Amino acid sequence: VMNRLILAMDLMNRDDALRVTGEVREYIDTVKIGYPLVLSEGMDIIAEFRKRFGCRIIADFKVADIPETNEKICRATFKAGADAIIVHGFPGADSVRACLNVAEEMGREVFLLTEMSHPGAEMFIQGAADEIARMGVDLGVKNYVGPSTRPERLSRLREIIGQDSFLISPGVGAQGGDPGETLRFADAIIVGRSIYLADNPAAAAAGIIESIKDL
């Protein structure tokens, strides 16, 4: 992705989301849109963004249902124009396979979320994360999400998925993660509040890119 930086656009107002995304567009080529924005403004926001900014859109819907419901969620999401969808691995292989099947049918991609970045991830997800990543490899998953807040875990996850797999990583900035250290293992970093709550989002994005280019 452009500059290895993905914007997590979690503002819940279309006008503010459009303003900030437009201000930082020269620095990115991929926007992660999740439920905070979609549940506030509608699924049409995905095609609006894709068109207005010509960016790729990753729908961060942390899909985590039974296979049959996961298939429906993925079909609705790709119909709305999303390029990729983020899926939880913890509900198991059949639930992930259902998403992979719809992505294959529709010419799109699935990102598998392994370990999460927040403190509570240590309770149950962390202990299962290596196995979730191995499950991804066995299912043919090529895109993964891992935590900026725990670079030693990001390293172990990169070890499991290999160098050919694409790995993106949230938790940079507000949650404490560092751009440069995270990019030692991930291909791209996801950044939300550090950019969208900044007094000058473009300056915040530029600052991050400068520290990345130096790597």
Ligand X SMILES: O=c1cc(O)n([C@@H]2O[C@H](COP(=O)(O)O)[C@@H](O)[C@H]2O)c(=O)[nH]1
Interface mask toward a second copy for 70-99; x: CB under 8 A: --xx--xx--x-------xxxxxxxxx---
Asked about 79 being catalytic, the answer comes back as no
Considering 51, 62, 72, 213, which one is annotated as catalytic? 62
178 is a site residue for ligand X (CB under 6 A): no
Contact 25, 55 (CB under 8 A): yes
Q: Which does 47 bind (CB under 5 to 8 A by kind): a second copy, ligand X, none?
A: none
Half-sphere exposure of 81 (CA within 13 A, CB side): 19
Please spell the DSSP secondary structure of 58-90, one letter per residue.
Answer: EEEEEE-S-HHHHHHHHHHHHHTT-SEEEEEST
The nearest distance, CB 83 to ligand X, in angstroms, is: 16
Place of tokens 């992505």: 103
The nearest distance, CB 47 to ligand X, in angstroms, is: 20
Please spell the DSSP secondary structure of 96-144, one letter per residue.
Answer: HHHHHHHHHHHT-EEEEE-S-SSGGGGTTHHHHHHHHHHHHHHHT--EE
193 is a site residue for ligand X (CB under 6 A): yes
33 or 209: CB nearest a second copy: 33
145 is a site residue for ligand X (CB under 6 A): yes
96 or 205: CB nearest a second copy: 96
Q: Give the number of other CB atoms < 10 A from CB of residue 127.
A: 11
Length of the chain: 215
Instruction: Please report the sign of the dihedral spanned by the C-alpha atoms of residue 190, residue 193, residue 198, residue 200.
Output: positive
49 is a site residue for a second copy (CB under 8 A): no
* CA gap 33, 37 in Å, rounded: 7
Contact region for ligand X (CB under 6 A) — 16-24, 44-52, 101-109, 110-118? 110-118
Encoded tokens for 37? 């924005």
CB under 8 Å to 197, separation ≥6 — which residues?
none
The nearest distance, CB 205 to a second copy, in angstroms, is: 20
The nearest distance, CB 115 to ligand X, in angstroms, is: 7
Question: Residues in the site for a second copy, rule: CB under 8 A?
Answer: 10, 12, 34-36, 38-40, 42-43, 61-62, 64-69, 72-73, 76-77, 80, 88-96, 116-125, 128, 131-132, 135, 175, 193
Residues that bind ligand X (CB under 6 A): 8, 10, 34, 60, 65-66, 69, 113, 116-117, 145, 147, 170-171, 173-175, 190-194
Residues serving a catalytic function are: 62
